[PDB]
Amino acid sequence: PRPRYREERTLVRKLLPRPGQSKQEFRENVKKLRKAFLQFNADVSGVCQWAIQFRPRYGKPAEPTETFWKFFLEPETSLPPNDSRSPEFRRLQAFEAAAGINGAAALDDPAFTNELRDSILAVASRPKTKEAQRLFSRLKDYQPAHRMILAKVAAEWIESRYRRAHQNWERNYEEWKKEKQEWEQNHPELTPEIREAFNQIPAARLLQNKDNCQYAGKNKHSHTALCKQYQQQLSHDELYRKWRREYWREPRKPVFRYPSVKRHSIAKIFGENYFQADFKNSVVGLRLDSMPAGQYLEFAFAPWPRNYRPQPGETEISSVHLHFVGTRPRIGFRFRVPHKRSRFDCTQEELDELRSRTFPRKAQDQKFLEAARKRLLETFPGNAEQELRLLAVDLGTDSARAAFFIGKTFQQAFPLKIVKIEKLYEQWPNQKQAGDRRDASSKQPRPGLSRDHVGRHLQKMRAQASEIAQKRQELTGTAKKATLQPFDLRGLTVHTARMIRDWARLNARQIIQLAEENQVDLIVLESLRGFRPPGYENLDQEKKRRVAFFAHGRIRRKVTEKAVERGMRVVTVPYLASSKVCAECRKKQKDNKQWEKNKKRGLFKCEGCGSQAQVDENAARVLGRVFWGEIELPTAIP
RNA sequence: GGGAUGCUUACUUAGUCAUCUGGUUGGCAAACCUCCGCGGACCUUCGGGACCAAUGGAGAGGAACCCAGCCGAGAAGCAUCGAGCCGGUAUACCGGCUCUGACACCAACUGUGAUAAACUACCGCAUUAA
RNA sequence: UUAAUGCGGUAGUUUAUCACAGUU
Ligand SMILES: [Zn+2]
Numbered sequence: 170p171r172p173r174y175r176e177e178r179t180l181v182r183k184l185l186p187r188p189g190q191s192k193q194e195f196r197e198n199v200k201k202l203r204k205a206f207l208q209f210n211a212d213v214s215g216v217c218q219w220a221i222q223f224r225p226r227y228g229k230p231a232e233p234t235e236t237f238w239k240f241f242l243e244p245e246t247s248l249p250p251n252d253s254r255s256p257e258f259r260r261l262q263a264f265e266a267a268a269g270i271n272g273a274a275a276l277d278d279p280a281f282t283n284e285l286r287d288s289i290l291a292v293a294s295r296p297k298t299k300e301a302q303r304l305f306s307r308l309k310d311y312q313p314a315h316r317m318i319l320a321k322v323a324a325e326w327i328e329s330r331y332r333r334a335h336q337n338w339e340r341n342y343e344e345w346k347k348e349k350q351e352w353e354q355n356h357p358e359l360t361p362e363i364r365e366a367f368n369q370i371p372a373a374r375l376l377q378n379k380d381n382c383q384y385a386g387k388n389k390h391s392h393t394a395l396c397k398q399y400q401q402q403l404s405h406d407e408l409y410r411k412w413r414r415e416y417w418r419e420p421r422k423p424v425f426r427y428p429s430v431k432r433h434s435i436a437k438i439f440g441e442n443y444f445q446a447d448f449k450n451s452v453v454g455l456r457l458d459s460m461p462a463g464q465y466l467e468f469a470f471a472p473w474p475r476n477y478r479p480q481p482g483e484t485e486i487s488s489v490h491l492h493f494v495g496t497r498p499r500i501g502f503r504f505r506v507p508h509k510r511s512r513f514d515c516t517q518e519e520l521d522e523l524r525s526r527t528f529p530r531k532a533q534d535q536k537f538l539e540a541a542r543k544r545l546l547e548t549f550p551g552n553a554e555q556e557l558r559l560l561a562v563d564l565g566t567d568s569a570r571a572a573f574f575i576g577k578t579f580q581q582a583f584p585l586k587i588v589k590i591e592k593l594y595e596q597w598p599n600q601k602q603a604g605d606r607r608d609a610s611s612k613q614p615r616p617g618l619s620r621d622h623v624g625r626h627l628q629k630m631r632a633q634a635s636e637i638a639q640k641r642q643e644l645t646g647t648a649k650k651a652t653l654q655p656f657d658l659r660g661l662t663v664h665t666a667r668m669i670r671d672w673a674r675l676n677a678r679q680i681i682q683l684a685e686e687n688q689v690d691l692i693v694l695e696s697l698r699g700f701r702p703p704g705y706e707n708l709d710q711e712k713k714r715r716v717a718f719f720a721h722g723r724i725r726r727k728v729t730e731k732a733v734e735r736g737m738r739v740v741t742v743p744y745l746a747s748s749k750v751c752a753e754c755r756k757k758q759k760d761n762k763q764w765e766k767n768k769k770r771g772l773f774k775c776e777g778c779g780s781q782a783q784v785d786e787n788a789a790r791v792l793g794r795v796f797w798g799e800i801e802l803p804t805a806i807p
Numbered sequence: 808g809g810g811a812u813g814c815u816u817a818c819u820u821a822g823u824c825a826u827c828u829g830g831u832u833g834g835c836a837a838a839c840c841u842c843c844g845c846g847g848a849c850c851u852u853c854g855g856g857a858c859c860a861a862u863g864g865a866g867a868g869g870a871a872c873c874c875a876g877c878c879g880a881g882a883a884g885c886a887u888c889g890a891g892c893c894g895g896u897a898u899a900c901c902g903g904c905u906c907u908g909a910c911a912c913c914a915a916c917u918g919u920g921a922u923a924a925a926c927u928a929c930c931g932c933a934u935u936a937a
Numbered sequence: 938u939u940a941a942u943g944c945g946g947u948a949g950u951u952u953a954u955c956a957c958a959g960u961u
Contacts, residue, residue, distance in 0.1 A: 188817075196873095307862075424850050427859035646841095656872065671911055
């Protein structure tokens, strides 16, 4: 439903000092950005301080100021579709009129309804937070264009974080009310009122509570507070079994959070007449709001990528999205890009709705498959049973192949060059030996993005981070007051943070060109959690090193954006085995160990069918058959 | 890597990899930072939890942070020798072309809810000395 | 009660995990 699949794939680059301006004035120019950058973030933070009190109450009579909150956050549904200036323009005047920053008081607009006109007046007859009072006077010193940007981004901060969450909580609280009210009469066997008694007096807690204090030995040897409560309840497990599941706790009500430089400083939108771009000489016209006439300050940057698919000349920039990571002011060039039409009558958004709200629970996983499988069939122009080209991404460790399926027939499976060396290979050069459930040992740093290589940078930070933590406690710390701060190390972290993030891009890109020679209609994905990452085994007491994961969840979102761009379609199915299941037969191998030994070499052996293919072929051919009715989810969770 | 090499620098060395964020020295300016709060501000197990915050005050370490410097690395404005391709000239000369690793150049940022794992902090039990 | 640990629980500090939704 939402237009999530827009004209994105924005280009961003790092800010570079011009070779011939200065070495200190360049820092003075960044500090010129900094003094304003901190100001706007402080300005928007104070705006939402005075607006959060306009929220709906949901259990109290509707205040006359509630309907202004609805309009100011969601004007598009409350306004006629023929708005003259802008939907954000209407919220600006309403916000201005509600506050004291309206010098003309122009709330008498034809597009403003009666429910909105009186609400704005009722809002002004309320005291402010004494923080916006000095802010509102300060906001009067900006150009209306600045207040145009400032007000609209201030609302968007409140829109999704609070209002949608608060309204979702209303549905959640109604759902919890309906659940708890029915549960009072539907579970009267041992909890008509005793469920409240247990409240007066959590895997470990559940085991101890559902016991007669006999489990306290397990809690102590292998959580004794819950065992004592269970023992006191008897003076037991019969009532604890239902009291815990009652979900007596109040639903998490929306606690508003405020804009900050540390965690989320919004990319300031340098819209029309506020940005410039030059890539023949990579210098950007970065202008602050302080200049009234639009004095674009010239700062060098990294030129346009040579092998980036949409060239600079085919597209026009719309606004610079600049932020502040560390100290370097990175910018973002938002533009448009032409997508490609898909060979279906449906869209990915329809499939998203099915997984999100129609089939959210893990127990409702199988019903999703048949619902999703038949959803595509009528939308297929030709015959999906004979023409639906399919590749199944597996995302292996050393090798990865996508099985090519059209009409349930397997043609061939070929791998990707997803490994980082000075020259790209197909696998890491490891041929030492093979073993079993006896032992394992290997100590050699593979040069690239390997599991051993990513852990190498982690060890170096241990020397630095421990010294930082130790010395910080000596200069002023002189021991439970604090542990450490996020700013101790950023340089090596972002190098490693982008390192894995670029590794995901390597998988993201390689599959895209892998699926372009064959017009693959549908691609399926898995959902794996992980068992044990061997990267960290000795490091401890840090906040800078566990960024060397594989980012399985992020990879699904690169391909989602690229698929609609190239007219491709991707889908994610719940966690089946997909690796302990044979491609041909539905044997459901339960050894779980001899597969892993074969997985090291990239091949496998089947217990039931005897196929001697590769695991990549095995995983991909299964996932392809999961789309068909031949293979389904094991549904062996209970 | 397929050429090697040098001159020039308010350049980069904070896309990754290529044994590799190369190592190292200072910091007056300045930034960073540590304690604070004119104040709010949501929820609350009413104990507290989390965040914003003055065109705001300080103070300090150069452990970090950030500013700056040194060596080297790599990018280029240009130059030297050599080869490939090619023609006019004659068996040779002249001239142009590419001459320099791979990858990716952010679907990105962000919040909330869970999983296993990690140390700090504190308590207690089982096992070790008085 | 002082010293060498292990295992639980709790919070300080995480990260990814899975899921959803915004600026774009
Ligand atoms: Zn089988």
